[PDB]
Predict the structure.
Amino acid sequence: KENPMRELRIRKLCLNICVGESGDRLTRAAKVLEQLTGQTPVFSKARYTVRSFGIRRNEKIAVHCTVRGAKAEEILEKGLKVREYELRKNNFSDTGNFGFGIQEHIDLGIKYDPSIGIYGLDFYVVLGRPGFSIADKKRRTGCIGAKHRISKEEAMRWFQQKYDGIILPG
Amino acid sequence: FVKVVKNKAYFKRYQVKFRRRREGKTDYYARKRLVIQDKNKYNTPKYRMIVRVTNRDIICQIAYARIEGDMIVCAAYAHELPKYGVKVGLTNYAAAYCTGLLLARRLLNRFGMDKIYEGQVEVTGDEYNVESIDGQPGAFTCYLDAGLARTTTGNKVFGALKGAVDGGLSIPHSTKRFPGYDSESKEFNAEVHRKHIMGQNVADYMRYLMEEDEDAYKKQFSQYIKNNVTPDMMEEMYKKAHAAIRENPVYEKKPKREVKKKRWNRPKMSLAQKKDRVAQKKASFLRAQERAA
Amino acid sequence: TNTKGKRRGTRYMFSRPFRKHGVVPLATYMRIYKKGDIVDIKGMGTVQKGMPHKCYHGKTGRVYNVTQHAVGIVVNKQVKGKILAKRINVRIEHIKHSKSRDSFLKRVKENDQKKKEAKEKGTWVQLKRQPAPPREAHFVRTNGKEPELLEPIPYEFMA
Amino acid sequence: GRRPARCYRYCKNKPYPKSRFCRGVPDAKIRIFDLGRKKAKVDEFPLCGHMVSDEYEQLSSEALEAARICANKYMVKSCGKDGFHIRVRLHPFHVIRINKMLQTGMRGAFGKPQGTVARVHIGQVIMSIRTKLQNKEHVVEALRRAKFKFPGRQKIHISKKWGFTKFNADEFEDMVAEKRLIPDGCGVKYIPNRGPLDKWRALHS
Amino acid sequence: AKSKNHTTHNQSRKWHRNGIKKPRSQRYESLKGVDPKFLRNMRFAKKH
RNA sequence: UCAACCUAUUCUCAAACUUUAAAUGGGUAAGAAGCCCGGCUCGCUGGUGUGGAGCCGGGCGUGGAAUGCGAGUGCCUAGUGG
RNA sequence: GCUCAGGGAGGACAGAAACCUCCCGUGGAGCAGAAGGGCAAAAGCUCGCUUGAUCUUGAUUUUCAGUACGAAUACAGACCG
RNA sequence: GUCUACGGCCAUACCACCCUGAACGCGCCCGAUCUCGUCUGAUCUCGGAAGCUAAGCAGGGUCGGGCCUGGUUAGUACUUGGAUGGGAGACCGCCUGGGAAUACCGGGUGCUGUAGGCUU
Ligand SMILES: [Mg+2]
Ligand SMILES: [Mg+2]
Ligand SMILES: [Mg+2]
Ligand SMILES: [Mg+2]
Ligand SMILES: [Mg+2]
Ligand SMILES: [Mg+2]
Ligand SMILES: [Mg+2]
Ligand SMILES: [Mg+2]
Ligand SMILES: [Mg+2]
Ligand SMILES: [Mg+2]
């Protein structure tokens, strides 16, 4: 007997590929996660300029996108099938989100082109709950209260009872 | 560790916002640019038509600013539209137009200018502006307060605006944000705005759902079905609502009831009670320590 | 030699008070000013438009002109050996009414009402504020107990 | 090479600290200010003798360190090595200037900084020794020997406070038995009747 | 050959010989600086 | 352990730091040019013979804190500016 | 329309520092420069349209001799954004 | 008793955690054809009424932090005027009037204007 407005939902699944340079690598990484998601991603620029890494200010160095809903759940399930449903206990943020990363997108189920190549991905799952739109609506913006937030164990129990994965320690 | 950010120094140096800014409700920048009368006008009122679209009704008020507050001249809501015959759907663009019309006609009847300044009796949708006639007492001029709505094209704020304009208020406006002004060709086809005022998009979505899938139709629309609102009835129902509002615009309040005077929330605990609470907490801790030792 | 800037020396003078920064409150805008209103000046840092000068921060004058954001007021400024009745244009949020006129106004209206009445009544009631007179003669009762005796404390250095 | 202290002796100027505007100050030579068994609780040194001043003058940092060494030498000779705790309760923040003449003259005369200087009021405590209650004469003799390293008139006063605390030595024992005070090193912590009472039940736990 | 730079020593009694006298207060002071649209209306009201 | 760190404490400060914050001091007011009515005018302002301002006409002296003192105004002008 | 400095907790190569996400965050950032004031649904940052950075008579403030130039403040008459 | 819409003074209203909300509301909520806008109907805009007071919000609690207002500190510090007072000086005392602020210890924890509800 629990109140149905505290169902743990995924609010978003955000993906990025930080290629570290502009041009060909970034455009074809944009095309590969557009092949992944089905929506045209956006180009993340650089705040600073560090020549140890080889980047400049306002230079397009990454590709990111944001996925909501059934597409988010299915992309996340593909990524966890890559990650064999095994996540570490350090892969869980204190605010209740989690996230992981994969190294080649070919393991997802996306077929290959030598015109494109291989890239790795950061997946990050921003969990929520019904009611978290208070934190970013406009007209009467409030905060989210203490009982309604998501703690770390309250998120990883949800993960291992909704995906039947394991939380290996370390 | 982290350094504790919200310490005694943080709260001592912290300045609060205004109460309405903390609650989120008002924009003091726009409110100052909107309500402050010119000082050479010398206590002439400056009237506003406040539109607030809630989740279930639409508050349209007309108020001027004094020092104690905004005294509201006239008010007209959307949940009072079943007095005139709009049974449900009270938050859409068409009900925004109806409550803007009701606000305008009720204020004109309150001041004594309902015969003069009739406005658009028939609804067209195009540009209208109530230009005042000489000799007769002048047109009512007020300005439109959107509050925090992002005032883009096709907004029910501007629906209530067009309702007051067709009711007879002389509000300054442009025909850029009514539904129908397309951003590409930069013109304004008034028949599309008339369809949105008469609720033809809602009737067409009703027809579209009962052609596509009736499960989604019964989930989306249900109180329409309960109050047997059909798509062909829609435009005639809104026209009869317009005619009913323009013939009987006055509001009669509900009678004031004799109360029971029962208190629904907990009253504030007193000084004696809370000092006795901390005395009993200390005594109960000490006796639990002696019964644990 | 000092600089002759318009805002020289006004660090603490046009600053807002502690924790009363931010948005200017709106009653300050909604107050209306006739001509002949006695008006105080207090310039404010949040609105740089219409700033009154540091010579006039704290002076009181009389309105002679009202415009659509600002009032012209007639203040007495003292320069080397004379007093100029000079007029300045001040935006509305650098300004208050003075209640020094208002206490006189209520005293005039209550004097005029008690001069209107209590004149066919026959009494003659005092209308001028004589200053605080010396205390009249009065008994002081020592009800029972004796006056408590005080005598100075012996010196001990406590620090 | 330093000018005598009788030049830089009265509180003549505005206080002119080492700051963003006066930079290039040579460093103050008293840098150790507390000495002795400074790691000792309030409960094992109950006596506290203050060298109080009796003039509104300026003490040099040189004189502060000279008086520190003159007190510490006699204390480690007399009361043993770690049976005391001196602390110098003045830190020199005012810096003083030197107009060097080699010919210009008094044209543009504003000095480079020479040294640091503490400004003292009539009744402000210069030094203070915390010790046991039987080492009374030794602390009076130590402060009396350190008074000759300062100008002017200093007096010696043995206070009724419990060492380096602001609480009186007669009721300190009753308060610490009543647990309104808590020892936390060379000072003591004061506990009001104002906290959340989880702190209360933690103390009386 | 320097000399004294600025002074306000004798100035207070120099002012108070003929007195710090307040400005000439007069009934019906003028209308210069009054709002010109307001004053157009005022002088039409006086015209008619 | 020893450091940084963190949390409650503690000693000493500031012309170009400050939550507080004096004394002395600086404006304004202490009425006839003031109040209170009646009515006209306006191209300004205007839901509103609304708002504001200007004009007329009438009525009201206990001269509206103390003290003291006849005031206001215009020419011409020397010397001075270590 | 959005919130800035900093910090915390996470994420393939990635680290002390590239990018993504949550949370705290009264200004500890930014506003060309010197400092002082001022500023958070803004005066900051990002976008859309732009030329009131235009034509013109008076009044005023500031230094002041109660003169100039400079800079600025309310108005007013168009022509505009 | 209380809520919404617009507010005034802007912490006695803020902040952290816990408890309780009947009715109307306010919300969360369900969708994206149309209006609109985004990488993403998350936000904004648009059409609704299956569910829930879980959150916001409201009322209350905390020997709570803060804030407000009092006592103490203290007639202390400082100070107007005065002396052919003291002191080698620094500085201090007195006559004449004014008179602060920490630490420490109490009390309070939004009032309120206009319009419209609920308590059939
Ligand atoms: Mg706005
Ligand atoms: Mg000097
Ligand atoms: Mg000479
Ligand atoms: Mg000369
Ligand atoms: Mg803006
Ligand atoms: Mg700018
Ligand atoms: Mg949605
Ligand atoms: Mg709730
Ligand atoms: Mg609840
Ligand atoms: Mg408290």
The radius of gyration of chain B is 27 Å.
